[PDB]
Enzyme design. Structure first.
Site, short mmCIF file in Angstrom:
data_model
loop_
_atom_site.label_atom_id
_atom_site.label_comp_id
_atom_site.label_asym_id
_atom_site.label_seq_id
_atom_site.Cartn_x
_atom_site.Cartn_y
_atom_site.Cartn_z
N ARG A 141 0.83 -1.21 0.00
CA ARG A 141 0.00 0.00 0.00
C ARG A 141 0.86 1.26 0.00
O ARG A 141 0.33 2.35 -0.37
CB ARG A 141 -0.93 -0.01 1.24
CG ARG A 141 -0.23 -0.01 2.59
CD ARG A 141 -1.12 -0.05 3.87
NE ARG A 141 -0.34 -0.24 5.12
CZ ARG A 141 0.12 -1.42 5.59
NH1 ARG A 141 -0.26 -2.55 5.12
NH2 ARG A 141 0.95 -1.46 6.59
N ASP A 155 5.36 7.45 1.87
CA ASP A 155 4.63 7.41 3.16
C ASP A 155 5.33 6.56 4.22
O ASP A 155 4.88 5.50 4.68
CB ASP A 155 3.19 6.97 2.94
CG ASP A 155 2.40 8.01 2.23
OD1 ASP A 155 2.88 9.13 2.03
OD2 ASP A 155 1.23 7.65 1.82
C1 LIG Z 1 1.37 12.81 7.84
C2 LIG Z 1 2.66 13.60 7.59
C3 LIG Z 1 3.12 14.62 8.39
C4 LIG Z 1 2.38 15.01 9.60
C5 LIG Z 1 1.76 15.32 10.56
C6 LIG Z 1 0.98 15.65 11.75
C7 LIG Z 1 1.63 16.37 12.73
C8 LIG Z 1 0.87 16.75 13.88
C9 LIG Z 1 -0.45 16.46 13.91
C10 LIG Z 1 -1.23 16.85 15.18
N1 LIG Z 1 -1.22 15.67 16.06
C11 LIG Z 1 -2.40 15.59 16.96
C12 LIG Z 1 -2.38 14.21 17.64
C13 LIG Z 1 -1.02 13.94 18.30
C14 LIG Z 1 -0.82 14.95 19.42
O1 LIG Z 1 0.55 14.91 19.82
C15 LIG Z 1 0.13 14.05 17.28
C16 LIG Z 1 0.09 15.47 16.70
C17 LIG Z 1 -1.12 15.77 12.89
C18 LIG Z 1 -0.37 15.38 11.77
C19 LIG Z 1 4.28 15.32 8.12
C20 LIG Z 1 5.06 15.07 7.01
C21 LIG Z 1 6.23 15.90 6.71
F1 LIG Z 1 7.30 15.09 6.34
F2 LIG Z 1 6.03 16.63 5.58
C22 LIG Z 1 4.58 14.03 6.13
C23 LIG Z 1 5.05 13.47 4.95
N2 LIG Z 1 4.17 12.50 4.64
C24 LIG Z 1 4.13 11.68 3.41
C25 LIG Z 1 3.51 12.48 2.32
O2 LIG Z 1 3.71 13.69 2.18
N3 LIG Z 1 2.71 11.81 1.45
C26 LIG Z 1 2.13 12.40 0.37
N4 LIG Z 1 1.40 11.70 -0.45
C27 LIG Z 1 0.87 12.46 -1.48
C28 LIG Z 1 1.19 13.77 -1.42
S1 LIG Z 1 2.21 14.06 -0.04
C29 LIG Z 1 5.51 11.22 3.06
N5 LIG Z 1 6.30 10.54 3.96
C30 LIG Z 1 7.42 10.27 3.31
N6 LIG Z 1 7.39 10.75 2.06
C31 LIG Z 1 6.16 11.35 1.92
C32 LIG Z 1 6.09 11.88 0.47
C33 LIG Z 1 7.49 11.67 -0.08
C34 LIG Z 1 8.19 10.75 0.90
C35 LIG Z 1 8.85 9.45 0.44
C36 LIG Z 1 9.71 10.62 0.97
N7 LIG Z 1 3.12 12.40 5.50
C37 LIG Z 1 3.37 13.34 6.44
#
Ligand SMILES: Cc1c(C#Cc2ccc(CN3CCC(CO)CC3)cc2)cc(C(F)F)c2cn([C@@H](C(=O)Nc3nccs3)c3ncn4c3CCC43CC3)nc12
Length: 281
Positions: A141, A155
């Protein structure tokens, strides 16, 4: 020309929703970068919850690391939009996730495609190992399809929502028992990912509650040999699931092994109609 672009809302638009998961919703969209004319097909992930300025600093620091991921088999983060619910932008992978692809195209996939995906995923994971980036959630996935011949990892784990209990059925035993994650625990998850591909997207440990997985692994039980797989391919999967993490293959060794198999793919995977990309001998 910044490595990570900080986007305005006016520069992009959502076209069609693609999926929702534990962290947000992904859309197909279009981006015209500020100061440019070209239309770039993008994937836009909008987070589930609104975030504070403080939370956004932690998102940003991680976003700069993801923008530095530069390898043909790993998606790069291109931009971020610091809206109240943050949006994250990558290049669109137009064929979607590999798990759905193998389930939807199971009757038109041969041994060459499957083994080349295994090579490509190992190449991207070896890149992450060289960067000292542990994925922590490798699974079919979380592999995307740019073309049928070109896949990329995405992801990273940040502990299909019903696969998380953490993705117990993909995790190495030491990750389940002690929340230890290393490049060698990613090798275990790679083996499960290969099993998913070789079963055209079947569910691992189907019938076992997640709560019982560490017990069955400790008893020595493993995922079964897929019908298409020769024992040689199954043996590499089994090596990925050895209890001693340092005994598992490394990604560099998995690239060598799957690359050799991809030279004579019909010898290693037996698929009806697939009569006996890395060139085949
Ligand atoms: C979920 C998340 C977050 C986040 C967060 C969050 C923080 C606080 C809270 C509040 N939260 C409340 C509850 C508690 C309280 O402590 C925790 C905090 C909620 C969410 C941050 C980043 C950051 F890196 F940019 C993320 C990056 N991805 C994905 C991503 O962007 N995938 C996409 N696919 C389509 C287009 S982009 C990702 N991963 C790796 N890759 C990627 C793309 C490229 C690549 C391989 C290299 N995913 C991210």
């Amino acid at each position: 020309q910044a490595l990570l672009r900080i986007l305005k809302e006016t520069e992009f638009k959502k076209i069609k929703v693609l999926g929702s998961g534990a962290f947000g919703t992904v859309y197909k969209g279009l981006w015209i970068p500020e100061g440019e004319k070209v239309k770039i097909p993008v994937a836009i992930k909008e987070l589930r919850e609104a975030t504070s300025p403080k939370a956004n600093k932690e998102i940003l620091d991680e976003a700069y690391v993801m923008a530095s991921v530069d390898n043909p088999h790993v998606c790069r983060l291109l931009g971020i939009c610091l809206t109240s619910t943050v949006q994250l932008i990558t290049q669109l992978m137009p064929f979607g996730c590999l798990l759905d692809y193998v389930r939807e195209h199971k009757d038109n996939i041969g041994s060459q495609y499957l083994l080349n995906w295994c090579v490509q995923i190992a190449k991207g994971m070896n890149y992450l190992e060289d960067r000292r980036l542990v994925h922590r959630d490798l699974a079919a996935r979380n592999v995307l399809v740019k073309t049928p011949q070109h896949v990329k990892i995405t992801d990273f784990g940040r502990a299909e929502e019903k696969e998380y209990h953490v993705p117990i059925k993909w995790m190495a035993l030491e990750s389940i028992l002690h929340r230890i994650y290393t490049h060698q625990s990613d090798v275990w998850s790679y083996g499960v990912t290969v099993w998913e591909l070789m079963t055209f997207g079947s569910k691992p440990y189907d019938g076992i509650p997640a709560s019982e997985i560490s017990s069955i692994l400790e008893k020595g039980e493993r995922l079964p040999q897929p019908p298409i797989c020769t024992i040689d391919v199954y043996m590499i999967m089994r090596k990925c699931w050895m209890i001693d993490a340092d005994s598992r293959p490394k990604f560099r060794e998995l690239i060598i092994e799957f690359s050799k198999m991809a030279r004579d793919p019909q010898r290693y995977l037996v698929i009806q109609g697939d009569e006996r990309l890395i060139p085949q001998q």
